[PDB]
Amino acid sequence: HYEEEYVLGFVDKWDELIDWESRAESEGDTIINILKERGVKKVLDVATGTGFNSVRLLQAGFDVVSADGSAEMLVKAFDNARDHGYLMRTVQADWRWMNKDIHDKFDAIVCLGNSFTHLFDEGDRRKALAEFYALLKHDGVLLLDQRNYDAILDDSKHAHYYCGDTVSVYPEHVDEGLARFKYEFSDGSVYNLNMFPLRKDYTRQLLHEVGFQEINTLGDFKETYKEDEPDFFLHVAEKN
C-alpha cells in the first residue's frame, strides 16, 4: 500500500535530517531517570519505529524488547541499533494482540513519540491498552506520550519547530475526530499525516478504565520555540 510507503518515506526523511545525538540532547534523561528510580530492568518498546527510544534504553543498560507492527520499521531499527553498536531484539506485533508473539512480562512499557494517537477507533484503543496492561508485571509501569491536542482544539494555529528549524509541524485541520499535520523539513520536503487528537483527560480516562491504578501526566516542552502550553504530555501509568 501507498500509505505504508508514504510513512516509510517520512521516517527516512526524519532520520536523514535529524541526528539522534541532537535528539537525545533535547529529550531529557527524564524517562531514563523515571525507569531507573523504579528499579526497572526489562523494558518493552511497543512503538519502536526506527529505534531511537529502544537504542536510548539499550545504551542506558536496560534489557529491551523492540516491537512494532511494521516489519519494515523493525529492519530500519535493527540496522540503526547495529550502527550504534547494539544488538536489537525485534518482534513484529500488533498492539491489539501483543501477547500473540510476546511471551514474557515486563517492568515497563514505552509507547513514545506520539504513537498511540494513530488509532482512530475507541475499541482498538481499549484493546491496545488492555494488551499493554497484561504485559506488565504486577508492579509494572506504562509510559505513553501524545501531543497536546487540547491546546489546538480550544484555540494555536501556527507551526511548531523541532531540532532547531530542521522540521516544522503545522496543524492543517483539527476537529475532535481528526488532526492532520503538515510536516515540512529544512530541505523542502513536505509530508502530511493523519492522527487522532487525544484529549489529555480522555487518555487518562482510558488508562483508568482498562485497570491502571495511578496515573501521573507530565507536561513536556519539546518544541524549539516554547509557548505557555507544553506541546506534549507524558502519561506515567502505574499498574499499581
Ligand X SMILES: C[S@@+](CC[C@H](N)C(=O)[O-])C[C@H]1O[C@@H](n2cnc3c(N)ncnc32)[C@H](O)[C@@H]1O
Give, in order, the Cα–Cα distances in Å from 129 to each of 6, 138, 153: 27, 15, 24
- Least distance from C-beta 16 to ligand X, angstroms? 14
**Of 13, 38, 42, 118, the one binding ligand X by CB under 6 A:** 118
Looking at residues 18 to 77 of the shown chain, list those that interact with ligand X (rule: CB under 6 A). 47, 49, 52-53, 68-70, 73
Out of 27, 63, 94, 229, the residue judged to bind ligand X by CB under 6 A? 94
- Is residue 211 a contact point for ligand X (CB under 6 A)? no
Stretch that binds ligand X, among 80-88, 108-116, 150-158, 223-231 (CB under 6 A): 108-116
Q: Is 135 in the site for ligand X (CB under 6 A)?
A: no
DSSP symbols for the chain: -HHHHHHHHHHHHHHHHS-HHHHHHHS-SHHHHHHHHTT--EEEES--TTSHHHHHHHHHT-EEEEEES-HHHHHHHHHHHHHTT----EEE--GGGGGGT--S-EEEEEE-SS-GGG---HHHHHHHHHHHHHHEEEEEEEEEEEE-HHHHHH---S-EEETTTTEEEEEEEEETTEEEEEEEETTS-EEEEEE----HHHHHHHHHHTT--EEEEEEE--SSS--SS-SEEEEEEE--
Between 213 and 219, whose beta carbon lies closer to ligand X? 219
Residue among 95, 183, 196, 233 that touches ligand X (CB under 6 A): 95
Name the minimum Å distance from CB 209 to ligand X.
Answer: 19
As measured in angstroms, the least distance from the Cβ of 34 to ligand X is: 16
Q: Is residue 230 close enough to count as binding ligand X by CB under 6 A? A: no
> Which of residues 17, 26, 60, 113 is near ligand X by CB under 6 A?
113
Binding residues vs ligand X (CB under 6 A): 47, 49, 52-53, 68-70, 73, 94-95, 112-115, 118
Binding site listing: 23, 68, 94-95
Binding site listing for S-adenosyl-L-methionine: 23, 68, 94-95
